Symmetry: D2
Subunit: 287 residues, 4 copies
């Protein structure tokens, strides 16, 4: 039938561009589905921050895997998962790929940042040599099914400029990476060059409050981008909404003022497809 990795490859192809929305949990995935998104995303920083932790590589394969499993249990919508640098050496990478496949994950992204750091080493954005990242990619490709999508993420644009970035990316593709992930380029007219040089489908990361700008989906597609990621958008809005409710309750002693801002029970039941549970019991049993 349709394998997760296939569904992702297909979505990447038939969408122009493919919009991929972050969802921090299964219910958010169901909202995204209901709105008609074709692919969803589990953000690494999202996993950490939702646990109340900074995005400093404290989390491991199990933290991400559990959140991924929760999502894929609720939806068949193809899921892309941030695996950071792969959580360790060759065999850990291999374990990550195999477990993500077992969890019905469609795609992962893995990046060219350094991991191997002294105990007390400060938060940084340092790149590994091209060869080290090649090794990472080989480790993953060795175990992956054909369908399953490995996205190589480079963080080198910010540090090494467009040319060095195209050079890394191309080497990553020949090491077996299926697709490429780069931050949103500083100039949308850098994109046609970047995309035609790497040939494989390219992902532009539309973060908020970062160094990088926002462009529209149409705009990015017209400049040769095939995937556009919104890694934390919903999450940031959820947090503002929650904080507002808490502040309301604390200040007013009741949640009256917040009621207009709440999803209705009726809408919640519809997203959960509650009726289909009732109908299932009527369809199968009696009494």
């Amino acid at each position: 039938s349709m394998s997760p990795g296939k569904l992702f490859r297909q979505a990447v192809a038939n969408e122009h561009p493919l919009q991929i929305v972050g969802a921090i949990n299964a219910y958010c995935a169901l909202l995204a589905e209901n709105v008609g998104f074709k692919a969803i995303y589990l953000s690494g920083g999202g996993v950490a921050n939702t646990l109340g932790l900074p995005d400093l590589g404290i989390t491991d394969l199990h933290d991400v895997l559990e959140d991924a499993r929760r999502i894929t249990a609720a939806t068949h919508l193809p899921l892309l998962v941030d695996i950071d640098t792969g959580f360790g050496g060759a065999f850990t990478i291999a374990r990550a790929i195999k477990e993500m496949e077992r969890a019905q994950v469609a795609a992962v992204h893995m990046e060219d940042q350094v991991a191997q750091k002294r105990c007390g080493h400060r938060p940084g954005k340092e790149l590994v040599n091209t060869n080290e990242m090649v090794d990472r990619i080989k480790a993953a490709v060795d175990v992956k099914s054909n369908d399953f999508v490995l996205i190589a993420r480079t963080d080198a644009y910010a540090v090494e400029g467009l040319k060095a970035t195209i050079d890394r990316a191309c080497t990553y593709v020949e090491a077996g990476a299926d697709m490429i992930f780069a931050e949103a380029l500083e100039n949308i007219n850098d994109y046609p060059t970047f995309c035609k040089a790497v040939k494989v489908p390219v992902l532009a990361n539309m973060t908020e409050f970062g160094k990088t700008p926002l462009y529209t989906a149409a705009q990015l597609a017209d400049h040769g981008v095939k995937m556009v990621l919104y890694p934390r958008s919903a999450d940031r809005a959820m947090s503002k909404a929650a904080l507002a409710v808490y502040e309301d309750i604390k200040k007013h002693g009741v949640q009256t003022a917040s009621l207009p801002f709440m999803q209705t029970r009726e809408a919640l039941y519809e997203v959960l497809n509650y009726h289909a549970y009732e109908d299932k019991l009527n369809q199968l049993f009696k009494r």
Copy 2:
């Protein structure tokens, strides 16, 4: 042991989660308890200055994309509880439904919630032992069955850990029958009582004086029950007020809105005013304290 108040070394007893909950219930008037579906939410609640937090059973299920039909088990709720208590020492109350099975399952639930550093649980008098194809229902077990559940829990619990008996009987059997069950639950060893928000706030003094132990009023939305202020409920002898799903419902509407924006406009520009700032995020995560810790302990 002793802690300094300024320069003065005075007695101070370190408190266990369950003690911190008992103390919060005492020093607050009334104690407001807010639902948080995850650790980040718990930190927001902490930041606003709530003294207790809550892990909703329906919240656990719905967040997994499941209806609140008793599908989830000890492990589902325990994992979400562990995630929260890892991030905060703020006393956490956890919904354990009917206890997930018979006497030894209840015992396991109590013990594991204690090990997860949970302060309190609530367990309710709904029927569990339903035929395979039984339709969703609000049936109560007889008072004796619930007594047995409470005995199972009390048998294993530490002294400090709080067991809250929840009755769902008000809606179906009225005030008197509800007071009767609750009183029996207290004598079976329930530390506190949990009931829906009564339809008439002037039924509360009667209810509270009859059961004597601290009473929780459940401030749900979009249900049958009304809303009152915390002050109002405290004036009628209520000692805890729970907001089980409030934040979650708002989070869902906000997420949906962002999704709809991105889908319709092909960019999230319109959504930016409605997003928490990265700076606020960093502050709630206490990011700076991580940087300072590395400077405090190491070189370079």
Copy 3:
């Protein structure tokens, strides 16, 4: 798609876990299924050349230090199943007790076992809906209740995935009542049938021909039931023979012995002859293939 047999490209269909189990049941006469409590045991079983493996419900509980009293839930067994299927593609049959709850819990159990790459489950006709303080018992549910459980499972299962209906009725209701239940279970959509080892091997031809679907005989130790050889059981129309706890019981006696040795002699010298060699361990773990993989893919 096509696979080479030597130089010749021929048709070959990749098989799903549940297919591999169906195929094993077909090409083996009979299929021996061995219990393994963990992934290492599963690899030992594989190394000896078993074609299927088993995750025992009582094994899951007892390994956690718990009696087999229905305390454990979907998550306990699922985690142990996941650990095994991570290590081996050998088709795994998993005990799901009564399904851990009503219709949607059963459905969840089936779906999660499929996602964990499990080939088959067994689900049984024991009572689940017991009062809080109910004593350990071997009560059966009526045939209709079990039919409902099976319908719940079949509703969600893939075609290949195997649902085995286990009856515990032989011991309490005799051969006829047992055949009656089993036949009803097959028509409710059970793929295969699981019964205790019959007290008389000459009751098997009757039992097997009446239920038509592949039958499993449970070769327990220290129970009421006898032992027969695999050949013997196959000659009487049995297609699966299960050894649910055999290895585990031996492992426990061995562990205890080592502990006793160390305690009594202050060193493990006497135990060394009874230990697997490090070299054997390395071979079962296929350690060399890790070294070769690094040489195959990288430099230095």
Copy 4:
């Protein structure tokens, strides 16, 4: 009352020496308890191998934590847990300590091996500089309760000889490590020197089939050792027993020959304390 870490400190003191047995799972812990051991151990290699994985640092905090939780749920006997090199930098170490405490673990051991290695780096026994390990220890000590025991394991004897090993160990103690873990020394008369130099309670690792020898508990105690670890002893015997049963069933078509080698149902019920469950239901209910 009695905190796990306290119970471990106390056992280390009042036993001469303290024998610590590996138990791979809760049932094994209960056997060890029944035999009268005072402390138990969760081996890192045991965790990996039981998962069907080589001891190559593929496992993470979650793998070990889950197995630890399972054991501590069943027994209050103080548990020492192998945390390898701590599964990452400063904050991962801190997470490991805090989670082990929450799991009711009494002690951990952390070692001075290198972790930070290229993707395809081969299995090795290379040491980090003394300073790197100091950093690791500081990270752990920063978060640990007073009671909870941090054991610094050095693997330097084999590579750097006795003197360099004493030098590392002493620095580890002053970095805040509560106790020291070394392989079994090649000569039991190296021990008095080693133990008096480091002052803190010392652990000798009694592995089988290794480079290092076996000595008796009495022998090691007389040479100034306060803990003796049997990391895999029971596990190796369990594996031989299991394999024999499998071979029996496969060859003979029945498990008859293996029955003499099985724990009886009666003994199993006693270890599980089954009777106390029956008595509890009679003590609390009726009918």
